[PDB]
Amino acid sequence: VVRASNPAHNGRVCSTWGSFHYKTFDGDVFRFPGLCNYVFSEHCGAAYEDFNIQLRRSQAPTLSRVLMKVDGVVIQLTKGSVLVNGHPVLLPFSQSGVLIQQSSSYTKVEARLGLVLMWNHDDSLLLELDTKYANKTCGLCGDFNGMPVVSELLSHNTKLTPMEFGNLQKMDDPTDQCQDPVPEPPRNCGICEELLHGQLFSGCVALVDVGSYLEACRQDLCFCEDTDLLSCVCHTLAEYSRQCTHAGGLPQDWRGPDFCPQKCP
Amino acid sequence: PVVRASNPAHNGRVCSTWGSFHYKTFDGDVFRFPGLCNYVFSEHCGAAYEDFNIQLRRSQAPTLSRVLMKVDGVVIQLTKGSVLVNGHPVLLPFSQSGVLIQQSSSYTKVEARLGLVLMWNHDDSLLLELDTKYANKTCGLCGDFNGMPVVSELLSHNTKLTPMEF
Amino acid sequence: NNMQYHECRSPCADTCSNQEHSRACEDHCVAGCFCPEGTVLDDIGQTGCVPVSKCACVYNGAAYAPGATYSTDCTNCTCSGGRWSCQEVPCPGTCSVLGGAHFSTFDGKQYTVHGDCSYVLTKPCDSSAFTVLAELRRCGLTDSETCLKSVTLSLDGAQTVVVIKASGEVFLNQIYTQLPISAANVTIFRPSTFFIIAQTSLGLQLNLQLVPTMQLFMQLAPKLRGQTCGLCGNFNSIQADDFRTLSGVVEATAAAFFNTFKTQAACPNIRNSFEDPCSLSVENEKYAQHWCSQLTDADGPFGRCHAAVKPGTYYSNCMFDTCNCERSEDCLCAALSSYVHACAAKGVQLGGWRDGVCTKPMTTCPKSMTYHYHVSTCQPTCRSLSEGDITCSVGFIPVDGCICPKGTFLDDTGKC
Amino acid sequence: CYHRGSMIPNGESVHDSGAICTCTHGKLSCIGGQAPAPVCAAPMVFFDCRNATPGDTGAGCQKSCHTLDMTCYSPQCVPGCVCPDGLVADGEGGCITAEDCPCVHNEASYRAGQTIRVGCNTCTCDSRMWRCTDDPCLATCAVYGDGHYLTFDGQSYSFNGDCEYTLVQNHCGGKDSTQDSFRVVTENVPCGTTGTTCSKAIKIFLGGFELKLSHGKVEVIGTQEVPYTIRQMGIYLVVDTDIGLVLLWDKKTSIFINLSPEFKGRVCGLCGNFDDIAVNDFATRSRSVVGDVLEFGNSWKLSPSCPDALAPKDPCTANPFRKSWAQKQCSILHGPTFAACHAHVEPARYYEACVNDACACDSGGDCECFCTAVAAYAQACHEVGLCVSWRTPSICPLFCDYYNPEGQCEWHYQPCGVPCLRTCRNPRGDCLRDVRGLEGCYPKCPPEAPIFDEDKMQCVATC
Amino acid sequence: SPSCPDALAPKDPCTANPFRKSWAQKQCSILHGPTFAACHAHVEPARYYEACVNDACACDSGGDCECFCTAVAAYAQACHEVGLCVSWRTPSICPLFCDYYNPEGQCEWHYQPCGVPCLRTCRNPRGDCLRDVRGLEGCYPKCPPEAPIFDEDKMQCVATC
Ligand SMILES: *[C@@H]1O[C@H](CO)[C@@H](O)[C@H](O)[C@H]1NC(C)=O
Ligand SMILES: *[C@@H]1O[C@H](CO)[C@@H](O)[C@H](O)[C@H]1NC(C)=O
Ligand SMILES: *[C@@H]1O[C@H](CO)[C@@H](O)[C@H](O)[C@H]1NC(C)=O
Ligand SMILES: *[C@@H]1O[C@H](CO)[C@@H](O)[C@H](O)[C@H]1NC(C)=O
Ligand SMILES: [Ca+2]
Ligand SMILES: [Ca+2]
Ligand SMILES: [Ca+2]
Ligand SMILES: [Ca+2]
Ligand SMILES: [Cu+2]
């Protein structure tokens, strides 16, 4: 009998969002601007692999393909297309304990072995894993053991950088050879300070630390290619709201007709 | 379970029909029954699941027209010049699901690995040889296979059954 | 036919295939048609009952005749009385290092260890007349991507050392030389741009494929049976003792015996895990299955070889290499070329097998060279025309690659 | 890029001193920025090729207790840790003499004078070498599952024949030889729909006597005294003969035939000819070695009129919907359950057979197929002295308590079994070896009643 | 979930998979033989036999023995609930590894068809059995008089908790 009464479960959630921002299961937040095919998360802790999720970006840090192997089922998610075992399917689609459903903002794949994948319309990928997979996974989401740095950024008593770790988590295509991203020097570049530290997210500060997301918002504001500075930080705020919801908090509405508007059917 | 065997005389395991409606049961009772209908030659009625069920039919000379065998879900129909397995004609020799059907110069033999051998010879004789594990568990024209000729075959309720009635 | 009807004879009838079936019978006697005494049934030809001396024999599905003979590379058999009488003949042995990790010893034992050091392939145990070393090194991010970077042939107690690198460079006694070389007890030449062949006078021959990856085929004369020892076994026709280390016992795993033939202490000890690379990527598995299944396709480009060489091991090597290594096409081409070379060694030619995949090497040789699927001769040169003798081993397993066209001689500046 | 004087193509990587350096854009970039100068503990000293005099190997010819070849092969200098002159590394950082290196066997180290057991012989470590006796002993032919065969000489193959096949027999060439003629014959039956076939009954013809092991019972068909000894130990039924032939039968599909060395080169059948050579074990009944497994198997059918077998379909390809389950069930052979045995028995062929049988066991009884496949590897592990426990209440349970009499608790599961357990036929408690690791339920008789009567199947004070 | 797809009518398990059908019947005949002869007058085995055959026909993805064991254990529990404790498990028919629970050197766990509603434990020290559960068969401990208490927290026989 296992008891769990703490709703805060950010430790079982890994996500990617914005300009190549990755949050591991253990809470580590880094930036890896890789456009290749990488292992998002796979079950390497056992002889038989229950799941294997890979994500690929394109160029606009937008995801182009998500590949899932869930107990003999191969699910490929492309923009406006879902393939199960190589054939196109019409959502909602249920097969072999895997349920794929589309909504006005996300595409969700739920696997009864205890995994949830959410590809949001903000080009953000989120993954909820069961606690039974702790200390048994690998990929860009960490080893899922609780320690943010141990056994992920340590190859052999060596402190790995996020670039090195992300390149280590690469899994390329047969005929598609990919070049690792070139580490670029900083560009030497505070809107996010008002909203993130304001009362609008106050009921969320006590549960999820904002420093990492503050840095992520600064990076997104500096790295994005249009001068919609008020509307170019929606992704980081949405990710912070998602993490607050996953932490047992109750975020209040922060959008508006002119500030990051969302359209509902 | 170790079972010893020394006597090679195994006439108690063999039932056959030949000639002018002559029948020999597993227990050694030889009688005549001039029936031209479809009759149960031998079937495994002593268990919840039936391992085998063999039926034979005669047509007029007392010729044998059809032999129907149900062997563990395999249906074999033997007619003059035709062998059907699950409703499909087959070319002999034919091996499937532990059942081997082979034709020789004088007979057609169906061997079932569960322990039965059926011989349809060219002098119009149908001979069945059963494994000893089926003793006291069969019924049909070949008797109940318990080593006693009259008891449990010619008795319905304490009475005596003539060979025609049986 | 001439069978007779009897009331009591054994149902186990003796035939040409089984001439002692009656003796090994468990059923009682029955009535039926039986062959006359002194004759057995002819099941091969269905010609009734024939005497034992007239019984035919069946080999590879083809019926032979009494007195007819067939021959393999290792034996010579003759049919008599329905049975094959076989005599052994001298038979050279073949060791193979393919893909940098797949080893097949002289006795046919096959294993797969991903080493990270220089290892002793073949060597006499009681002498140092010759010694072959392989530099198997990890050439990828993971520990299961091994490349054969060089092959070392040592002769007469390291008095003649030839190092052949994966880039085609040849070093004789630490001096970068130019092929062909006729050194002490060894001749090394280049039949094509794809292969380097080194033949020694001790009964040893090395075929080294350099395109796309370095692979080795060693051939040993029958005079060295039971005398060599290394990663290629002791060449004594027994597979059980091919994992016997120099200590004296036979190991149970390929990795444990493999790690005992290191040459340096700092080299890691390889432990064989149970990884399945094809399971780690959908696209890689699809590519490997699509392009490697041609080895086992009976009606494909390699179908004319399934009787000579069994393609199962080559199919497994193709799948593993294609799914594991980063350059999937290179490893797929290496596996296909290894199977083609084995077929050519068996005497089967599979020309035209590069249509569909591995097309690139056919269009990469120098300006005056052209590709050839079958190269069983030696390259003619201007020096060969002048002197009259060409430095070659005359007889070698046919190879493929880009050579000078017919009627054209290779000039000293690498031009036809 | 160039490393150690060797050209490294772009995209390739090298592994030096635990550092992985990849060659990209003509530059060798190492994981972790730069490899730090490695430091070797005393008495090993780091030798570098900066001051490399001609003819000096450095660390390129430094040997260890694992490098059994002491010849120096390096032509050029290689940096690394070097022990003092005339010393070799022991794998723990120290330096010892070559004669003092411990012996290595199956990923283990044994000091001088330690004893290991291979086959029937005993090997003692002595100055890096193994001293072993040269006593010949038996060979085991193992047939299990959907026609998985391993011959006396070690030839492993898969054959799916529907008829009765001669597993082993003597008097093959010349038909006279010596001894008394024996013949072990397997009876097969289709098991699945993909074309696979598994054994149903085993018939042993010895002298004028016949034993039929079928279902779960033995029949003495018979015709002197009976030259058989039937003994139920563990899950196995052991038939012992006085000619040197032992048969282990798991009572469902598995047979293990142990043949004494006196029968070398005098046997034939699907189990080979027992002459230490595995390639020639594919000898047909026409006495010709063939390459086709189907032809060799079909040549050994008892009845020439039985139809010849054909190549079956790939089970996991014909039945993909089961494949995952198979791969999820047979992964026990790769997990921590058998981790101690991976160094002594290679599980590759056992895992392949397990997956194939689970894929092909589509007509009913998947658990029996899986349990037989795993028990083959379990018996292989037990034969070499590894008492590995793998049966859980969810994985192939055994109902030992079924054998407990009313108000008694004696029967317990034994992985390696009880070789010498006191019984009526063995009052002194003797064990002849020759059978190892027969797992199953064995009785633990109390001191009050210490003799196990098999016929009564009870613990009694005296028989 | 309203968004979850509706379930459709499944195929006939013994028609889609006829090659299993015979086995299924031969496996499920235990529900009609002498094994459950005493229970046949108290629990009707018709629907249980039908479910057994259908499950064995449809258990084609792996683990048909689990399907068969569950189908027969349903009828076994129905029999046990009405006072009839039949012993149907054999080493070849749904074996139970009770010996797995024996501590090193001990022999306590036995298979009980009826179950032991009031075995003595330290959560019910007196030994009172609450009823309300009948015939929960399986492995139960028989603690010796030296240690007549069964501790489930540590799972062994002890004198007191
Ligand atoms: C995760 O597993 C490794 C495996 O040895 C272990 O060393 C480590 O302590 C584990 N971490 C946690 C948090 O349990
Ligand atoms: C055959 O079955 C009947 C019916 O119970 C029984 O009375 C008789 O004793 C049995 N005979 C033998 C030989 O078992
Ligand atoms: C086998 O050897 C004999 C005698 O040396 C020879 O005549 C015969 O041709 C050989 N077999 C073949 C197939 O050449
Ligand atoms: C060739 O080998 C033989 C035997 O190993 C040796 O006697 C001879 O000297 C070698 N040739 C040369 C040129 O050294
Ligand atoms: Ca960690
Ligand atoms: Ca009677
Ligand atoms: Ca050998
Ligand atoms: Ca042999
Ligand atoms: Cu959540």
Residue numbers in the entry:
A (entry chain B): 68 to 126, 130 to 259, 264 to 339
B (entry chain A): 67 to 126, 130 to 235
C (entry chain A): 340 to 755
D (entry chain C): 763 to 985, 989 to 1228
E (entry chain D): 1068 to 1228
Manuscript text:
We present a study of the amino-terminal segment of MUC5AC, one of the two main respiratory mucins. Though normally produced at lower levels than MUC5B, which is the dominant mucin in healthy lungs, MUC5AC is induced upon infection, and high MUC5AC levels are protective against respiratory viruses. In this work, the high-resolution structures obtained for two helical filamentous forms of MUC5AC, determined by cryoelectron microscopy (cryo-EM), are described. The structures of MUC5AC helical filaments also strengthen the generality of the bead-based mechanism for bringing D3 assemblies together for disulfide bonding and polymer formation.
In addition to the filament maps, a single-bead map was obtained at 2.9 Å resolution. Within each MUC5AC bead, two copies of the D1 and D2 segment, arranged antiparallel to one another, cradle the central pair of disulfide-bonded D3 assemblies, as in MUC2 and VWF. The two interacting D3 assemblies in MUC5AC are connected to the D1 and D2 segments from the two neighboring beads through interbead bridges composed of the TIL2/E2/TIL2′/E′ domains, as also seen for the related proteins. MUC5AC is more compact than MUC2, smaller by about 8 Å in both the long and the short axes of the oblong bead. The MUC5AC VWD1 domain contacts both the VWD3 domain, located near the edge of the bead, and the C8-3 domain, located near the center of the bead. A further interaction observed in MUC5AC was a segment of polypeptide upstream of the VWD1 domain participating in an intermolecular β-sheet by hydrogen bonding to an exposed β-strand in VWD3. In the MUC5AC cryo-EM structures, side chain nitrogens of the three histidines in the putative Cu2+ binding site were seen at distances of about 2.1 Å from a central density, which appeared at 14σ in the bead map.
